[PDB]
Amino acid sequence: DWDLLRASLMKFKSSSLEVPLVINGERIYDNNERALFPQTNPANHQQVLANVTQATEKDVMNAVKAAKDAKKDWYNLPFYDRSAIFLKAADLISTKYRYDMLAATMLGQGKNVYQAEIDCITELSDFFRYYVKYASDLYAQQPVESADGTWNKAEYRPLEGFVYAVSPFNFTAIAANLIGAPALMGNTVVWKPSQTAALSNYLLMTVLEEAGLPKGVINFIPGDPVQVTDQVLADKDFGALHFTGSTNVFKSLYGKIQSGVVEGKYRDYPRIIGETGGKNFHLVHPSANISHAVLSTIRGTFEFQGQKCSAASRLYLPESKSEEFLSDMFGILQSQRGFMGPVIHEQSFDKLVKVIEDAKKDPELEILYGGQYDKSQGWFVGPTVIKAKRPDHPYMSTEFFGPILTVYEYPDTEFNEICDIIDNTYALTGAIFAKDRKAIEYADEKLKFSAGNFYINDKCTGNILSRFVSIRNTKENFYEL
C-alpha cells in the first residue's frame, strides 16, 4: 500500500507530464503553438511535475461553445445518470486511482500523505456523494392538486447561461466542488484550474471522463488567469461565476462582471457564487485549558502552512496566561527540516518574506518565534509568531496565507472589550477557548457577525446547489369560463 503510493510518486517524479486542455472531450496539447506553464514541486522546485498547456483566446471561445452545445443533452440526461458519473468518479478516485491522485496532490500542491488523503480522496468523494443526496431531495417534487382545483408541478431548471468555474490551488476537493455542484444540476462548465494544481486537477478531469462525463459538459482550460478570464467574460451567454480564492481576485472578477452587466453584455443577470478567505481568529479567555488552546492554535495556524481559507491567523491572549501559552507553543514548535511543508509558489514565498522582513523594521511588531525561510530547494517558510503592540495593527487584519500568526495580548479584565474590538474591527471562522459559560455565551453573541463559523474549544479550521437552479412552476386550470 505504501509501496503503491511510492510507485505513484516515483512515476510522476521520474518524468514531466504534458497536461493538455480538455475541450469537448478532446485532449488539446501545446502542439508547437501554445505556451507551456511549468508546474514544479513546491518541496523541490527544480523538479517539473508537469508542462501545462496554456489556453489561447481561440481555445477559450471553443470551450464556451462546447459547453453551450452540450447543454440540452446534459440537462435532458436524467438526474440518475448525471449522478452516476459523479459517484463513479468519486469511487474511482477512492480506489482505482487512489495512489495516482494522492501522488499528484502531494507532489503538485505540497501536501504530505495525510493532508492529501483528507483532501483529494475523502473530502472530494464527500462533495460528490453529498451533492447527489441533496440534489436527489431537491428533485423529489411531486405534482399536487391545490385547494382551488388547479394542478401544479414545480421543476428546477439549470441556469440558462454557462458556468465559469475558477478553482484555487489549495484543495483538489474544492475544484471538484466548483465544477460538480453546478454540473450535477444540469449546468455546463468552463473551468480554469489553478496553475499550481494543474496535475491533480487534470487527473480529476480524466477521471470524470472515464466515469462517462459527456463531451463539453465540463471544459478544462488552464491558462493565463487574466487572459482566459477576460475572454470567458466577453460571451453573452455567461451565466455564473463559481469562485474560490483570494478576496482581491474575487473583487477583480466581480468588477469585471459588473462592468459587463451595466454595459449590458449579458443575456441574463449572472450569478456570482464566491468563497473567499478571511483573517480567522482564535480568542483565548483566561479560563481556558491552556494546553488544548495551544495545540489547537498550532494545528489551526500552521497545518498545511496556513494555506486554508479557514486557517487561524490572529490570536488574542489574556496577559495573565500569555507567557505560559507562548512558552508552551514555542516548545512544541521547536520540538517538531524545521519546516512542516512548503508554500505553493515563489510569489507566495516572496510575499511571506516581505511580511517577515517588514516585521523586523516595524517598531509596533516583535517577532517572538521563527521567521525562518529558505528558497534554495523549495518554497520553505517556517512557523512564525508575531506580537503586535496594538490590536488594530494591519498584521491583525491583512491576509497572509502562510504559516504566520499575529498575536495581541489583552489585559484579562478587558475580555468583553476585546470581543467588541474584534466585532467592530471580516472573517470566515473564529474560535473561543474558555471554560466559563458566561464568557462563552457573551463572545458567542457579540461575535455573531464576526464569523460564519464559530468554534468553542476547537480550532477554527474545524444548500449551495440551489444557487445553480431556478424554480419554474406550472399550473394547470381545468375550469372553462
Give the active site residues.
275, 309
**Interface with ligand NAD, residue 252, by CB under 6 A:** yes
Q: Which is nearer to ligand NAD, 309 or 356 (CB)?
A: 309
Q: Which is nearer to a copy of itself, 3 or 137 (CB)?
A: 137
Position with the least CB separation from ligand NAD: 277
Which x/- pattern over 303-322 shows residues binding ligand NAD (rule: CB under 6 A)?
------x-------------
Q: Which is nearer to a copy of itself, 109 or 177 (CB)?
A: 177
- Contact partner, 29, from a copy of itself, ligand NAD, none, Cβ < 5-8 Å per class: none
* Grid cell of 430 as nine digits: 473564529
Which x/- pattern over 296-335 shows residues binding a copy of itself (rule: CB under 8 A)?
x--x------------------------------------
- Contact partner, 427, from a copy of itself, ligand NAD, none, Cβ < 5-8 Å per class: none
Least separation in angstroms between residue 241's CB and a copy of itself is: 13
Q: Which is nearer to ligand NAD, 180 or 186 (CB)?
A: 180
Annotated binding-site residue? 255 = yes
**Interface with a copy of itself, residue 424, by CB under 8 A:** no
From the list 214, 225, 260, 274, which residue makes contact with ligand NAD (rule: CB under 6 A)? 225
**Interface with ligand NAD, residue 276, by CB under 6 A:** yes
From the list 17, 85, 166, 388, which residue makes contact with ligand NAD (rule: CB under 6 A)? 166
**Interface with a copy of itself, residue 354, by CB under 8 A:** no
Q: Footprint of ligand NAD on residues 393-452 (CB under 6 A)?
A: 399, 401
From the list 253, 388, 434, 439, which residue makes contact with ligand NAD (rule: CB under 6 A)? 253
How many residues bind to a copy of itself according to rule CB under 8 A?
80
Annotated binding-site residue? 257 = yes
Binding site, annotated residues: 255-260
**Given the rule CB under 6 A, which residues bind ligand NAD?**
166-170, 192, 194-195, 225-226, 229, 245-246, 249, 252-253, 276-277, 309, 399, 401
Binding site, annotated residues for NAD(+): 255-260
